[PDB]
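Input record (Table S2, row 210):
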Amino acid sequence: PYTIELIQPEDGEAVIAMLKTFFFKDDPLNTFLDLGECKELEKYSLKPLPDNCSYKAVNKKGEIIGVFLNGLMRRPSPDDVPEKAADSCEHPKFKKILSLMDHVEEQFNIFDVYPDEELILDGKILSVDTNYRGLGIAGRLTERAYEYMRENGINVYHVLCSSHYSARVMEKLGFHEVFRMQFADYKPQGEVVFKPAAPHVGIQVMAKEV
Ligand SMILES: CC(C)(COP(=O)(O)OP(=O)(O)OC[C@H]1O[C@@H](n2cnc3c(N)ncnc32)[C@H](O)[C@@H]1OP(=O)(O)O)[C@@H](O)C(=O)NCCC(=O)NCCS
Ligand SMILES: CC(=O)NCCc1ccccc1
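Output record (N-(2-phenylethyl)acetamide complex):
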């Protein structure tokens, strides 16, 4: 038995402890790179918390067994200066992940898909404790975000998935692909950067209109 609760920034340490145990070690990109200690990813993960739309799954003992960290994304201003997230990163392995993210954003803008939308919910970090996987926790974390969206007049939930495996979970939850890129085709400087196992395939950006 578990609950789904809003994460407070004072939960930051417990969220990071959980992510270090699971996500830092078992997201397909993190594990491919053997990420290790990564304070930049800790910083990245804590950033969306004050947006007040991130959720934790908590077991009967009060331990965090899952999180979905979300941030609000606003349509770029007409005079927007696009910045590469990778430019502010010192960690070489995480920089590769940020560079991949920058590349996706250079190729695909979710706001082009939804010209009328000013604000979109962005699902940034999804992680469930191994012993609690396959129980629908990812779905219940996601569903709680629908409540936030309803309350705040947000229509679109956008989630960049790091593998076809997790994209399939989002499909089950009613999301559909809006962009994809195979790892085999991601060659920023002429050569492949990510070579995880074949079934991962590549990134898929998933979206749902609620
Ligand atoms: C992706 C992830 C959050 C899914 O969470 P979840 O709460 O287990 O989600 P679900 O319960 O819907 O299970 C998803 C699928 O995992 C598989 N599964 C079943 N039992 C499982 C288990 N004990 N362990 C792992 N996977 C299992 C099933 O294929 C299941 O689909 P199905 O129940 O519809 O048949 C989780 O696997 C995870 O933390 N992965 C590592 C980090 C990651 O990749 N995050 C997403 C980045 S986009
Ligand atoms: C929804 C979700 O969890 N996307 C993960 C992207 C990602 C971010 C940082 C490191 C590795 C991978």
